[PDB]
Design a protein around this nucleic acid. Sequence first.
RNA 1: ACGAGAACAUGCGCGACAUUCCGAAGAACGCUGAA
Length: 288
Amino acid sequence: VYGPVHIGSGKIIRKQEYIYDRRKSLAHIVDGPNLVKFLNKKGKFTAYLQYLNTTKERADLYTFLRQEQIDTNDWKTFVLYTERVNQGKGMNDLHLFVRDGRGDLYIPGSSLKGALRTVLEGAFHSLSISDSLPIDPKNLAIYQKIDINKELKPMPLYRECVNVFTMKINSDDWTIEKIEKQIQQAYLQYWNKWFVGMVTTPGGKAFIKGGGLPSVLPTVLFLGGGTGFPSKTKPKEQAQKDIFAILQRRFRNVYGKMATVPKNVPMVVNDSTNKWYQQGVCLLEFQP
RNA sequence: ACGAGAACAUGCGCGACAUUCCGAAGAACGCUGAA
């Protein structure tokens, strides 16, 4: 996991749903009911409602708590847990990581299997992949999605990502050497056909200047989300033409209006450490 | 002082045997909008 990886759980929580300490630089992920009943008991529920009515757009919970000056230990009692944060801008949005019924951090094996199937294509019953081992929640830190299209820009999409598996095959259908060779070939194709376009852009120059890409980057996979359209899907020029056509067909606003073929289709992460990072990249190891 | 009188359509018996709700699925893509 050389880059922050977020596997969504279908739940997106707003700024007002959780607390964000800017000075302490930590995000308190809180459940709803505990906070609601705490405010009902302490008389802060009507105050919270008036706060929501006063400022519709920005309703950060931490600023409201500071305005009411509530005790920090009274904050901890309704907080589900806390996470270390990284922002390039209070946070706007937040995407939660996938948690099973018990609540441990884990990457589902289905994500790995789907990524492997996509990269290998170019059936699939023999390759049986199971869930990865549980990970302690402290590795779950909140990162930001940043778009680099000739210029870097922070985005409101903040995502809970992991900080930077048992599998069985049948010998005839799949082989470890063949699948790893195909993974490496797919990564090389991704580098040659699309990564060079981002290298040439000035935003890419800024990214490499700060050492954003790992020096080492073998077997590299795009496990989680935020990786891009070059993944999750040919001659180079024909491929670019197909992506441009499909983007024009689907996204009427950004791509449909503009007729000219961009420099690279598609046109497009900050951490408290000076090194820049990219979302979704992972390094894998297979043992028999 | 009835082609009549008596006379169980009854005895035994498993709706059973064989059967993977399963195979295929990355929670992900565009990155921007307003002032």
